[PDB]
Amino acid sequence: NQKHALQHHMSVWEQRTSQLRKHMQM
Amino acid sequence: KQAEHVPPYDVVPSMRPVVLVGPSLKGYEVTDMMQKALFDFLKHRFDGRISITRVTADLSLAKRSVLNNPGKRTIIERSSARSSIAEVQSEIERIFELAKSLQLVVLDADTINHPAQLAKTSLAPIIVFVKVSSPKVLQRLIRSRGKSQMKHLTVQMMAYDKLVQCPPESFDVILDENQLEDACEHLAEYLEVYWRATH
Amino acid sequence: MSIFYVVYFVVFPFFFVNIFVALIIITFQEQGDKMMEECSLEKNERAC
Amino acid sequence: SFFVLNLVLGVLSGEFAKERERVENRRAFMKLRRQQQIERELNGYRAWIDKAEEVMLAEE
Ligand SMILES: CC(C)CCC[C@@H](C)[C@H]1CC[C@H]2[C@@H]3CC=C4C[C@@H](O)CC[C@]4(C)[C@H]3CC[C@]12C
């Protein structure tokens, strides 16, 4: 929608799972 | 420098006609149905202000420096007398006068499949592209059409990839939306501002 | 008639209750901080 | 009873969170996400086909 015109309340689980993913590929 | 002598000023219609290209070869069940839904909104939204016409002949060969008079008469029995250039060359004035009335005209040819084929025509309408974000939905959409469409799926997908390679820039406007109202509003907004841009 | 009770036990106390527990677990907002940009780069190393 | 149940729940939830980020699980979830995205984009286009089809029959 922000492109059609052109032309952090996460829970503890969400934060920890997002951080666990970016530190897994390495 | 008379080999080409490209003119600086070329006669163009007063109002840009409307051409819709994509997502594959025209004249098939999927592409005729895909493109037809857009016209009905134009008729209902711009009723009393839009002219709707369908042309069956080819238009990619609409050139300006072919000859002094290619096929002037059909009684000379020349090469162009029996050819299809006589009717095609006659109808290019038909679109010119229709747009001269300061009213929009839609074009429904069954021969346009790429903006590069309409890059050498003095008519030069508005190129609007209806495209799917991914190729994976095309084959699944073809499967629901019927058994006849699956037989021509090989050629149906042939143009989809090729038409993707065309610079978006080449297209005048894009319609990457997937619903009715957003696409209808997006198309109407451009033309409504364009309608007030000519007056 | 023990089919009814087996199906009931498989559905409600074995599946729905664990659904409630999982939903509470995965949607637990932090209470002590209640802040948006505490470190904005990490969360665990703040103690470290 | 209560403390052991709390510890079991915590350990199990932590292990589930840790194991949800394995490579195979991530691949399966990405496959499911792409399937759902394709279906979502395909459903919107089907409205065009029916809306057009209704109009032409109405205008014969
Ligand atoms: C999606 C949810 C709501 C499905 C619920 C299905 C439940 C209610 C159904 C599925 C199997 C069913 C049972 C199958 C067999 C029998 C034996 C028969 O002599 C009496 C009914 C009884 C005991 C049925 C009671 C209703 C039952 C337990």
Numbering used by the authors:
A (entry chain A): 724 to 730, 773 to 791
B (entry chain B): 163 to 361
C (entry chain A): 1399 to 1446
D (entry chain A): 339 to 398
Sentences from the paper on this structure:
Voltage-gated calcium (Cav) channels permeate Ca2+ influx in response to the membrane depolarization. Cav2.3 channels, a ternary complex comprising the extracellular α2δ and the cytosolic β subunits in addition to the α1 subunit, are strongly expressed in the cortex, hippocampus, striatum, amygdala, and interpeduncular nucleus.
As seen in other Cav channel complexes, α1 and α2δ−1 subunits are well resolved, while β3 is of lower resolution. Briefly, the α1 subunit is also featured with a down VSDII, while the other three VSDs are in the typical depolarized or up conformations. The closed intracellular gate of PD is secured by CH2II. Five PIP2 species, 34:1, 36:2, 36:1, 38:3, and 38:2, were detected in the lipidomic analysis of purified channel complex.
